Scaffold this motif. Sequence first.
Motif, short mmCIF file in Angstrom:
data_model
loop_
_atom_site.label_atom_id
_atom_site.label_comp_id
_atom_site.label_asym_id
_atom_site.label_seq_id
_atom_site.Cartn_x
_atom_site.Cartn_y
_atom_site.Cartn_z
N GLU A 117 0.82 -1.21 0.00
CA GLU A 117 0.00 0.00 0.00
C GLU A 117 0.86 1.26 0.00
OE1 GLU A 117 -4.25 -0.79 2.18
OE2 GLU A 117 -2.48 -0.67 3.48
N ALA A 118 1.95 1.23 0.76
CA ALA A 118 2.87 2.37 0.80
C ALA A 118 3.50 2.65 -0.56
CB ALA A 118 3.95 2.16 1.87
N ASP A 119 3.78 1.59 -1.31
CA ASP A 119 4.33 1.72 -2.66
C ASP A 119 3.29 2.42 -3.55
OD1 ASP A 119 6.24 1.45 -4.64
OD2 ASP A 119 5.66 -0.61 -5.16
N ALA A 120 2.02 2.05 -3.40
CA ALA A 120 0.95 2.71 -4.15
C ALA A 120 0.87 4.20 -3.81
CB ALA A 120 -0.39 2.02 -3.90
N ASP A 121 0.98 4.53 -2.52
CA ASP A 121 1.02 5.93 -2.09
C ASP A 121 2.20 6.68 -2.72
OD1 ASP A 121 -1.24 5.62 -0.48
OD2 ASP A 121 -0.08 5.28 1.36
N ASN A 122 3.37 6.04 -2.73
CA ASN A 122 4.56 6.61 -3.36
C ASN A 122 4.36 6.94 -4.85
OD1 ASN A 122 7.22 5.87 -5.06
ND2 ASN A 122 7.81 7.00 -3.21
N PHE A 123 3.78 6.00 -5.59
CA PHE A 123 3.56 6.22 -7.02
C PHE A 123 2.44 7.24 -7.26
CE2 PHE A 123 2.22 4.43 -11.34
CZ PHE A 123 3.22 5.12 -12.01
N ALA A 124 1.39 7.21 -6.45
CA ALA A 124 0.34 8.23 -6.53
C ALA A 124 0.92 9.63 -6.35
CB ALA A 124 -0.73 7.98 -5.49
N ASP A 125 1.81 9.79 -5.37
CA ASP A 125 2.44 11.08 -5.12
C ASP A 125 3.31 11.51 -6.30
OD1 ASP A 125 1.20 11.24 -2.68
OD2 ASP A 125 3.01 10.97 -1.48
N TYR A 126 4.05 10.56 -6.86
CA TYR A 126 4.84 10.84 -8.06
C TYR A 126 3.96 11.37 -9.20
CZ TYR A 126 7.07 9.89 -12.54
OH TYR A 126 7.52 9.98 -13.83
N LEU A 127 2.85 10.70 -9.47
CA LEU A 127 1.93 11.13 -10.53
C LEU A 127 1.29 12.48 -10.24
CD1 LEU A 127 0.29 7.68 -11.16
CD2 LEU A 127 1.91 8.86 -12.68
N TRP A 128 0.81 12.65 -9.01
CA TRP A 128 0.24 13.92 -8.58
C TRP A 128 1.22 15.08 -8.79
CZ3 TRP A 128 -3.51 16.98 -7.77
CH2 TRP A 128 -3.43 18.06 -6.87
N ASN A 129 2.45 14.92 -8.31
CA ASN A 129 3.41 16.01 -8.36
C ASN A 129 4.05 16.25 -9.72
OD1 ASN A 129 3.26 17.09 -5.68
ND2 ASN A 129 4.31 15.24 -4.94
N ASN A 130 4.12 15.21 -10.54
CA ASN A 130 4.85 15.31 -11.80
C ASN A 130 3.99 15.48 -13.05
OD1 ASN A 130 7.97 15.00 -11.36
ND2 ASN A 130 6.97 13.66 -9.87
N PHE A 131 2.71 15.12 -12.95
CA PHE A 131 1.80 15.20 -14.10
C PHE A 131 0.53 15.98 -13.83
CE2 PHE A 131 3.94 12.43 -17.08
CZ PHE A 131 4.73 11.63 -16.26
#
Length: 273
Positions: free
Chosen positions: A90-104
Amino acid sequence: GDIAIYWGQNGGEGTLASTCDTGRYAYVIVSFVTTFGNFRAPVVNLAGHCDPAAGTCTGLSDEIRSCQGKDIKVLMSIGGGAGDYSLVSEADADNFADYLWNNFLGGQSSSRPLGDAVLDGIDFDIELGTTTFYDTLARALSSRSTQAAKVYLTAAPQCPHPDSHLDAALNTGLFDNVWIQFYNNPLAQCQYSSGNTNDILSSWNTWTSSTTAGKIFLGLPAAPEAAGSGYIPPDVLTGQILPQIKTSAKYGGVMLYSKFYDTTYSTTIKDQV
Ligand SMILES: [Cl-]
Ligand SMILES: [Cl-]
Ligand SMILES: [Mg+2]
Ligand SMILES: [Mg+2]
Ligand SMILES: [Mg+2]
Ligand SMILES: [Mg+2]
Ligand SMILES: [Mg+2]
């Protein structure tokens, strides 16, 4: 109905701006974030169009805006059939969500791959790897939505139902559009083959009546060479398939893979969609 099209995996397909300027598409799906997971730096690939890691795709934001000024939604797709991805927790999903939110999306980053434009949302094109934590990912992204700025969520499951990789994500109820890939599944009784519209019509009914999303799209290859199987000649599509599926309350239109292969297909079918 509307036409959605994938763009980004063939430098010969025209620029993103040109794709939008055709006037044929209501959604353009930029593809792909090809690798991600286990908290590692994702890789973005747009073939020869530009090199995200080199910083040469930042000019794409003017093209994204040109699309948006024409009321076209521009989505960033994660995954694809050639990539290498999985979420480990779940933490990995949070990490990737944050990446997408901040970068795209509407977040902030000093290294946005495509520049300062705000993509309209994320397309889940999860075709391989483990099936876990994509519900986690969808929920994390959706929670970044504001009333002022919507994060669209779309998905591209394969036609066998339910879809192994996306069913849990879809069951969150959070997805806006689902374009089902009625191709590359020739033994699964869900796509078109010569002399057989029965399977695809039946699969369409299953998908529309079993999914929470508000708009459902018929996903097809734009040319015989765009997929291994499932291509429908345009006169068969417009004569034998579109009139029936358009009676569904949730019919949204047609999705095409991909811009490179769509030299004539959307032009031919445009007024029937
Ligand atoms: Cl890394
Ligand atoms: Cl199959
Ligand atoms: Mg370049
Ligand atoms: Mg179910
Ligand atoms: Mg496949
Ligand atoms: Mg028959
Ligand atoms: Mg229906």
